[PDB]
Ligand binder design. Structure first.
Ligand SMILES: Nc1ccccc1OCc1ccccc1
Lengths: 172, 172
């Protein structure tokens, strides 16, 4: 039975997430700007829905038929604790707890990013240990469990140099 | 976590153990087969076994792992330390689970009385199950943290509560 982790896939300059056999979500800035296909499908066959730093792809055929469809929502209630599902090219999997806040336009290393704010709950400074995000992590999904149901609520768009603050881009 | 730490994590009995040095191997007592008389092709005679509850240390007369340097083993860590539990999963995926350590504790978990250093997972809010939390096959995985320029091992995985949010480190 396929884990959540099998849905996290290397893509462009970062990552994305399979919501169902036909639906893939990612951060807009990691998508190649020169392409004629993705995952073997011509771009003519792909519906692309862009909303700021959130992009959804809907494929005309089943790319990941091994998966069931899961619930995608437009962010989550303020105060929800989500996990960001970070994969690294070493083969490490780094699920990190994040407390989610308001939807806002936030100044992150001198640039405006719009999405749902969050604060990492892994403590003082990750630097040294596997406790924080890095630039190559963009497009990792934000997920949480709600009774028996898993929910995905957005994708990793930005983080401060400091480490504490992240932005989860969300569906419009 | 550094490659040399992952190199020390060894599939053993019904779980894992960890090479502290060329001659010293630590594990959780319950993953050792009750009938076993040989370890790394050496007989019991040629091994010094030091057992304290669910913590077992093996000291070999011969260098079994001459590729390794000896590192620091401590008796648990200060309350408040964030550790990584070095868990290997189905296919070369490496899961360094973040945990905030607390007090020494005595608990009853399912059918067992367990004693060691308690902690709480920092991977998400509802960690039960294999994606964000521990499973029974994880017993013996090491708890490690970075101190200034050194890494330390401070225990081995012994148990997790029914909810999966609390874990127990067996300590020397
Ligand atoms: N919820 C909340 C409310 C106030 C301050 C922190 C908070 O996070 C809770 C929390 C959950 C998982 C792992 C660590 C912490």
């Amino acid at each position: 039975p396929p884990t959540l982790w099998s849905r996290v896939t290397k893509f462009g300059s970062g990552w994305g997430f399979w919501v169902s056999p036909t639906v893939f979500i990612t951060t807009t800035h990691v998508i190649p700007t020169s392409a004629k296909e993705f995952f073997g499908e011509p771009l003519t066959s792909i519906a692309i829905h862009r909303a700021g730093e959130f992009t959804l792809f809907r494929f005309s055929k089943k790319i990941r038929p091994d998966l069931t469809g899961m619930i995608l929502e437009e962010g989550c209630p303020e105060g929800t604790v989500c996990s960001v599902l970070i994969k690294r090219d070493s083969g490490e999997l780094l699920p990190l707890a994040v407390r989610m806040g308001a939807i806002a336009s936030m100044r992150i290393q001198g640039r405006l990013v719009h999405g749902q704010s969050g604060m990492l709950l892994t403590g003082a400074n990750a630097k040294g240990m596997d406790l924080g995000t890095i630039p190559g992590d963009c497009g990792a999904p934000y997920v949480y469990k709600r009774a028996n149901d898993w929910v995905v609520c957005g994708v990793h768009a930005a983080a401060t140099k400091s480490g504490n603050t992240v932005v989860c881009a969300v569906q419009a």
